[PDB]
RNA sequence: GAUGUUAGGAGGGCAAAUCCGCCGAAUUUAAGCAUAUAAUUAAGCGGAAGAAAAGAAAAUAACUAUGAUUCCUUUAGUAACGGCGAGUGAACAAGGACCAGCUCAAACGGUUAAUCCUUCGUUUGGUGCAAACCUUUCGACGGAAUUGUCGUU
RNA sequence: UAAAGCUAAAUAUAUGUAGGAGACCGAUAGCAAACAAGUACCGUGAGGGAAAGAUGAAAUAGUACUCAGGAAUGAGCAAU
RNA sequence: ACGGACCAAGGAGUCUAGCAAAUGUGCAAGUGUAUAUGAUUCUUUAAACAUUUUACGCAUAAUUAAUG
RNA sequence: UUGUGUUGAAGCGAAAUACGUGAGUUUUCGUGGAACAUCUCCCUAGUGCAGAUCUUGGUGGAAGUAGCAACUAUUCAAAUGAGAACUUUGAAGACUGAAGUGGAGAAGGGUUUCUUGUCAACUGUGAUUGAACAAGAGUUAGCCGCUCCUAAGGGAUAGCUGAAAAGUGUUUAAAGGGGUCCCCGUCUCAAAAGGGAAACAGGUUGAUAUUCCUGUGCCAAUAGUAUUAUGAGUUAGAUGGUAACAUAUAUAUAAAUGAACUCCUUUACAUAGGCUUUACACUCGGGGUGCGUUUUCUUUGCACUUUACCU
RNA sequence: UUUGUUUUGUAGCAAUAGUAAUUCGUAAUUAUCCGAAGUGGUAAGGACUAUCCUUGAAAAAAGGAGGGAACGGCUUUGUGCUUUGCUACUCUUAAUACUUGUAUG
RNA sequence: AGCACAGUCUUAACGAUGGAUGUCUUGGUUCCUACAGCGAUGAAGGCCGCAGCAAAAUGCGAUACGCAAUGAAAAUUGCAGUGACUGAAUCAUCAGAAUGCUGAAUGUAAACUACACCAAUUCCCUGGGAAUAGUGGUACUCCUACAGAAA
């Protein structure tokens, strides 16, 4: 017999994604002494369409404390958050609707 | 027509202008030959061969008085200096090859292969 | 169905594939993967295989010029020390 | 590794290798005042400006730079209107 | 096609110039002759 | 260890008939075929010389004993291996060609690294028309080396 | 007397180069190639790959001249 | 039934190893001088010639798994 | 061993009151023009052809046969020429019918282009033609493109595997730049239709034209010092409008201080539908100029009546 | 220095070019190049509406902004800083001259 | 000036086509002998050039069918031309000089004659006088030495 379709799925020649207009990967916020003890806000500026995928995804920018300047975030956004929104992330963040907090 | 021997003797001068001359008739020649005219063009190939020679003796010159420069100072240009097979060169000296030790070279000097006869 | 198996498609041959090598200089050199197919050319070797005695003895070394071999031949019956010059008249 | 052998680089005895004298220069020369010269192929239109000036003492407006399928290149120099192409061609022949 | 590199155009040349008859002087003492439209470059 | 367009050097690629490592088939034969054979072959990868590789016994023998390696004659299609089928298959002695032996480690030397290299100079003479080459030992400098060079056996 | 190392000769050479030979082949043979041969030419490519020698002692004897033809040619009382 | 339109040239039981039989030849219980050596041989000659009184093969004895 | 050859060898064609049973042998004539036998005996082999859909080469009958059938279609006269259905010119009849055998390009080709000769072969008939043959010539750019950027992606570096060959490409990298210690940071290739500094018109050659000429522009670059001149601002940075915002018109709107560090915008983006504006296109009427029809009619039918980039 | 009325100019390019004509030795002269509209074919732009479990590149390069680091000139004390006496001064374009390797393409 | 029927087949003589046979052989083949590495001092291979008229092959490298030197030594010639009355014409040898762009190719690249950085560079006279945008260097790995930084 030869290689059947499953098989020449995992070589990665023409099954590669199709990711040409993909956004970016969603992640939230690398750990940081903020988010283990406080509160760090972030302003939501966008939500985006992601091609791959039907979650939006929320572009929230974030004011870098070690240096200044600002970070731009791709999160998954949650149903109900708006741009304009600020969402607090870290272990003191109060629980709502975007939040980022310890389980 | 010239010869190298009676240029030998120039000066570098008198070498240099000499070949810029016969390069000017040279090229003089050659636009006769690209116009119609042609009465001329079997004097190219002496006003070449002449423009070689100039060139020969000339660089032969530089050379020459190069290598007096470099003369000893043990450390000559790679152009100047052997240009032997890579191997030849990278191969152990001769001195380098028959070395011997002092334990040996004495057991040698000691006891030599000797000449002798049988009845 | 035009261009079909035969003439029709054979009408649609043009773009080369293969171009001329600057080592080799034979059209051998595949256009999108940059590699001579005849000696490899952006690979240091040469490409040369034992189960092709035609294709190493048509570009083995004596098929060319050998502008500097050919030279030192007969250096080893003259055994003359370099620098040296005949002795003059 | 030192050089002792004058240098074999391209010279204006060898950048310009004569002139052209085909219809098509020789009309050139009285109708639109320029000069027409094949030359070596590793000549560019500085080289060609720079050796004409010290070949024959005449500055150029422009060199226009063709390659031809001969192996060599041709220029077609406008020399400046101060002067005029016909003196300066009938000089050189 | 109109548009050429320097290294394919010199070679078009050179092919051109190796195509011209043997000059009667020599003799008076060629099989490497091509068409352009018979034998192709393929160079 | 880093980093240096610091000074001086080396490797790279071609070429292969002979040569040295690796990797590695199947056709084939067995009147089928699977072990076996083809074959420690072909193909593939790498590495040297005018030869290479092997080589001065952790060797044979069992004799009245031989004495590094290689090659030739022979041992010998033998001992042996093998669906003990097809097939495969050495070694010692014997006669010859050639013939060559050695040094590290370890030991010993501390009233003294006794060694080595780089660079800069000096002359002892010689063959060359020249270019260039062969000999020369007094050093000085800067290093390496006791985490060990050299001498002795 | 293992677990370190060097070593010439006798040995081999379908390679390259240079000599010398033969109960060999004699242009469909012998190398593919006696020659402008790994050439011409074919294939996108890896690769495939020919055919083709001889006037005469001398062209420093390669056909002068005439006639007929537009010419190629032909013929001759003409010619090597 | 298959091959052959025609002509020319080319075109197929050979070479080596090993065994035996047959026959010719030499010597004969011996036969073969292997490799190698020497020799005023060295165009031929890469062949011819030669071998200071247990090299080896085959034969000269067979039989047995075998000590024998 | 012992012979033949320029007083003609081998070979070849035809033969012979020839010999043999036969394979053959031997002779004659002609051709040929330089080598050839040995049968005295023996040694040696790539040693004997009718076949193998045998190999290579040459040549037949088929046979002056099949055939020279798409693309509506040619005709008259003249020129050239040795020669004209298929070369050129004029006249006529027609075709292609802007989805064109019309103009521009790409791929591919590579001199087929142009001029002048020219016909051995080719141009499946002819051929004086030709993309054939021969000799010359021809391709001009700051503005058209490549070159630069990045994409799908390719190669390479560091490592890590692997005998290597090769496989992957940040998986323990101390890996160039900026300001003046710190910040950022793999390299390189990949688009002649993506992104992108800047040109138009008229003319010109046998063959080149946004490339040449003429005229008019545009873009980029332009180092240091010192002079002038232009403008602003200043007793270290201007001013108007409530506001939306506007203002430097010097040859030329050049200057409206501005570091590190930042944050944005442009580049920069799908499809469908209609509505609308402009330019180009087409068309109608008037005026002018030229031409055409005119037996009859016709204030008539046709052509020209143009205006680039830049400011 | 404001608002109403006329002439000129194809707004400059520009008529000098082009085109179609009439003549003249065979290169020059002359005349025209202006009065109004309709159709919607093509192209581009605009402002919109709608569709997607499809949302339809990047970089080179360029620009804007936030911020407010640095600060006149001539002379002078001491060790770039406090200081004394006087003020017309800083940028921006263009040209020129000299240095800079030959300072447009 | 007259006569043969035509076609088909057979034979002979002479021709045409074809290239066998014979004879030649500056070639091949096999054996023997001898020597044997080339390369960053840039190889083999590939391109591109070079002659007065010059396509190929052969030779050569901007000094380009050849320079210099050494030995022989008068021719070389298709034309043109060049040669002494022997560094000159031509052979042979080949040691000096020169050896384009590439290619391991090695500054970055490559269907680019594209793009860097660092020294400006080269030549002439015996410190001046010129000319040049031209010339060198810059790969990766490793060794010896050196350098200043680090714990």
Redesign the pocket.
């Known amino acids: 017999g030869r290689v059947i379709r499953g098989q020449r799925k995992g070589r990665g020649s023409i099954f590669?994604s199709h990711?040409?207009?993909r956004?970016g990967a969603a992640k939230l916020r690398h750990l940081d002494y903020c988010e283990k003890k406080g509160y760090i806000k972030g302003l939501v500026?966008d939500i985006?369409?992601?091609?791959?995928?039907?979650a939006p995804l929320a572009k929230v920018?974030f004011?870098?404390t070690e240096?200044?300047?600002?970070?731009?975030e791709l999160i998954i956004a949650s149903e109900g958050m708006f741009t304009g929104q600020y969402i607090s992330c870290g272990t003191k963040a109060p629980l709502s609707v975007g939040n980022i907090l310890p389980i | 027509?010239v010869?190298?021997?009676?240029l030998?003797t120039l000066?570098?001068?008198?070498?240099?202008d000499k070949l810029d001359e016969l390069?000017k008739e040279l090229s003089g020649l050659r636009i006769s030959?690209a116009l119609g005219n042609?009465?001329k063009?079997?004097?190219?190939?002496?006003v070449?061969?002449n423009?070689?020679?100039?060139?020969?003796?000339?660089?032969?010159?530089?050379?020459?008085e190069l290598?007096?420069l470099?003369?000893?100072?043990?450390?000559?240009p790679?152009?100047?200096?052997?240009?032997?097979?890579?191997?030849?060169?990278?191969?152990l000296?001769?001195?380098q090859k028959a070395a011997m030790?002092?334990?040996?070279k004495?057991?040698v000097q000691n006891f030599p292969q000797r000449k002798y006869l049988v009845v | 169905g035009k261009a079909g198996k035969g003439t029709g498609s054979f009408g649609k041959?043009?773009?080369?594939?293969?171009?001329?090598?600057?080592?080799?200089?034979?059209?051998?050199?595949?256009?999108?993967?940059?590699?001579?197919?005849?000696?490899?050319?952006?690979?240091?070797?040469?490409?040369?295989?034992?189960?092709?005695?035609?294709?190493?003895?048509?570009?083995?070394?004596?098929?060319?010029?050998?502008?500097?071999?050919?030279?030192?031949?007969?250096?080893?019956?003259?055994k003359?020390?370099?620098?040296?010059?005949?002795?003059?008249? | 590794?030192?050089?002792?052998?004058?240098?074999?680089?391209?010279?204006?005895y060898?950048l310009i290798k004569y002139p052209?004298?085909?219809?098509?220069?020789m009309?050139?020369i009285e109708?639109?005042?320029?000069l027409?010269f094949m030359c070596?192929?590793?000549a560019?239109?500085?080289?060609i400006?720079?050796?004409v000036?010290?070949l024959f003492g005449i500055e150029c407006?422009?060199?226009?730079?063709?390659?031809?399928?001969?192996?060599?290149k041709?220029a077609?120099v406008?020399l400046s209107?101060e002067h005029d192409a016909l003196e300066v061609a009938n000089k050189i022949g | 096609?109109?548009?050429?590199?320097?290294?394919?155009?010199?070679?078009?040349?050179?092919?051109?110039?190796?195509?011209?008859?043997?000059?009667?002087?020599?003799?008076?003492?060629?099989?490497?002759?091509?068409?352009?439209?018979?034998?192709?470059?393929?160079?």
């Open positions: 590669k990711n040409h207009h956004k500026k985006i369409h992601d091609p791959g995928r039907g920018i004011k870098r240096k200044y300047g600002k970070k731009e | 027509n010869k190298a021997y009676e030998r000066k570098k001068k008198e070498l240099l390069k030959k042609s009465a063009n079997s004097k190219i190939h002496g070449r061969k423009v070689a020679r100039v060139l020969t003796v000339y660089n032969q010159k530089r050379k020459m290598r007096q470099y003369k000893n100072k043990k450390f000559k790679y152009n100047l200096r052997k240009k032997l097979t890579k191997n030849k060169r990278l191969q000296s001769p001195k030790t002092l334990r040996q004495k057991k | 041959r043009n773009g080369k594939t293969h171009f001329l090598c600057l080592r080799c200089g034979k059209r051998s050199y595949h256009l999108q993967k940059k590699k001579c197919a005849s000696c490899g050319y952006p690979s240091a070797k040469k490409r040369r295989f034992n189960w092709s005695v035609k294709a190493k003895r048509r570009n083995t070394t004596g098929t060319g010029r050998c502008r500097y071999i050919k030279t030192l031949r007969r250096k080893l019956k003259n003359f020390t370099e620098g040296s010059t005949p002795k003059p008249k | 590794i030192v050089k002792s052998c004058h240098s074999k680089t391209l010279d204006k060898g052209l004298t085909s219809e098509k220069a009309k050139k109708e639109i005042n320029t027409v070596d192929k590793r560019n239109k500085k080289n400006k720079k050796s000036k010290n407006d422009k060199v226009n730079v063709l390659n031809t399928l001969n192996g060599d041709k077609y406008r209107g | 096609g109109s548009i050429k590199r320097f290294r394919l155009k010199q070679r078009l040349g050179k092919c051109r110039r190796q195509n011209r008859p043997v000059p009667h002087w020599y003799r008076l003492k060629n099989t490497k002759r091509r068409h352009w439209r018979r034998t192709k470059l393929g160079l």
